[PDB]
Amino acid sequence: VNPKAYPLADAHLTKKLLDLVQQSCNYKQLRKGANEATKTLNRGISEFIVMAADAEPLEIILHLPLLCEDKNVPYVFVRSKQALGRACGVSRPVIACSVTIKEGSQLKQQIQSIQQSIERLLV
């Protein structure tokens, strides 16, 4: 993968992140695309932002950790963009996405667990 994509999750961590992204997009609480993810991170409404290491170029996803330095949000990089695209439900591969917080959503505990598990990978 790309060395500039940091931090990188494991296999089960990427599976849990894809399941959380599918549960957020199925409940109309996720934003696909890097532009919508960075806009939700700059707006202060994005709970978590996930990236992908299989992006061409890999520097275009480099705004996703830097926005994590601008809003104090946990960031993570997936292994492939095609699995994140299917996880988002979009046939096109997704190199970036965002799980945003809602007004008392049922998946808030899973989003908090994903944010607690993704913050320990960057060490």
Binding site: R43, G44, N72
Partner: protein, 397 residues
């Protein structure tokens, strides 16, 4: 039945007239003697709707003993309309009815300090501190001792207030402010550290300690004091705003932006943190930051004042005047918003807008401001009016 009659009198005073409400209040006062609540309601109805208020105050003093609030309202109505040495004699007669020096002694000291012969006010403050020392009574005595000159008697009174009221951080903050105006500066820092270790959670005392540690150089100790103040609450918005201001005062603008981002991530529902994040951001990037602060923390006076300052900085007075009017209508008790509105009226506009801003500032007294408390706590402008303090706050911007 008396509560229903008082509610019907309040509804009649709010509805159509004031004669029937005064008649119902007189009937409720002449039917049976009540507590101080009915007397305070009758005094408020007499003040909101000269001689009748003085007669009601005399009837409350003659029929309802041990009523300090009604006696203080009657003394204020006698000093405003009737006479100041008559209100002084009324307060001296009320001192023989209530021997407690909680609120009558402070009101008598304020009435003696509003006029001349302040040595009698200092003697009354010393007698109130030696008879029944309290927190606010010792704070007012230390303020009256330090407004004239920084004598050693003021330091002894501050030491006695710190020994008798160590749980109250106001006496420690007053002792630190008195020692900061002396020749040395280590005693003020020691008193501020003792007040921070004895409260243990004192936000303005730790803010004054951080200001003293930053103004005397070696501001890493000031940043450590700000971090200890933010962790001692824990996660205080005022300590985080003070740490962001201390980081923005130096050459580390990116560290101040990171501290503001951490304060927004730890407390998004803060007006002062949103104003600091809107002021520390870029000028073409503030149009989205102000919208995010309005969407996150709506109906806030600090966010509205920051939006008014951003509209005035963008050479748009027609939007800045409406933003200042909305900030004055949302919360008229703010000092920084009123000072910014007065500065915007004095910078761009006719004299009618400045006169309206001065009337709005003189109607409701501003408090708890960032720039208002810097001039309202100093000894040079402690016994000044609201208009001179507003002019000094507007001229220092």
């Amino acid at each position: 039945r008396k509560h229903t009659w008082m509610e019907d009198a309040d509804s009649c005073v709010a509805h159509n007239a004031l004669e029937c409400a005064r008649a119902i209040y007189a009937y409720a006062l002449q039917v049976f003697p009540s507590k101080k609540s009915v007397w305070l309601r009758a005094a408020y109805f007499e003040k909101n709707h000269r001689e009748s208020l003085e007669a009601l105050l005399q009837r409350a003093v003659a029929h309802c003993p041990k009523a300090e609030v009604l006696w203080l309202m009657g003394a204020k109505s006698k000093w405003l309309a009737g006479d100041v040495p008559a209100a002084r004699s009324i307060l001296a007669l009320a001192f023989q009815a209530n021997p407690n020096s909680e609120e009558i002694w402070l009101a008598a000291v304020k009435l003696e300090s509003e006029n001349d012969e302040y040595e009698r006010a200092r003697r009354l403050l010393a007698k109130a501190r030696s008879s029944a020392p309290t927190a606010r009574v010792f704070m007012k005595s230390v303020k009256l001792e330090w407004v004239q000159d920084n004598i050693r008697a003021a330091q002894d009174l501050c030491e006695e207030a710190l020994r008798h009221y160590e749980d109250f951080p106001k006496l420690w903050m007053m002792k630190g402010q008195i020692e900061e105006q002396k020749e040395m500066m280590e005693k003020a820092r020691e008193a501020y550290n003792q007040g921070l270790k004895k409260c243990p959670h004192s936000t303005p005392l730790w803010l004054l300690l951080s200001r003293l540690e930053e103004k005397i150089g070696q501001l890493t100790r000031a940043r450590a004091i700000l971090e200890k103040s933010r962790l001692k609450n824990p996660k205080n918005p005022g300590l985080w705003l003070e740490s962001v201001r201390l980081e923005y005062r130096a050459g580390l603008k990116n560290i101040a932006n990171t501290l503001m981002a951490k304060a927004l991530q730890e407390c998004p529902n803060s007006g002062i943190l949103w104003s600091e994040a809107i002021f520390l951001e870029a000028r073409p990037q503030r149009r989205t930051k102000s919208v995010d602060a309005l969407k996150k923390c709506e109906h806030d006076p600090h966010v509205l004042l920051a939006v008014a300052k951003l509209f005035w900085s963008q050479r748009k007075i027609t939007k800045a005047r409406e933003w200042f009017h909305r900030t004055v209508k949302i919360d008229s008790d703010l000092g920084d918003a009123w000072a910014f509105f007065y500065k915007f009226e004095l910078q761009h506009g006719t004299e009618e807008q400045q006169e309206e801003v001065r009337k709005r500032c003189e109607s409701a007294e501003p408090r708890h401001g960032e720039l208002w408390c810097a001039v309202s706590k100093d000894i040079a402008n402690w016994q000044k009016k609201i208009g001179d303090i507003l002019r000094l706050v507007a001229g220092r911007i």
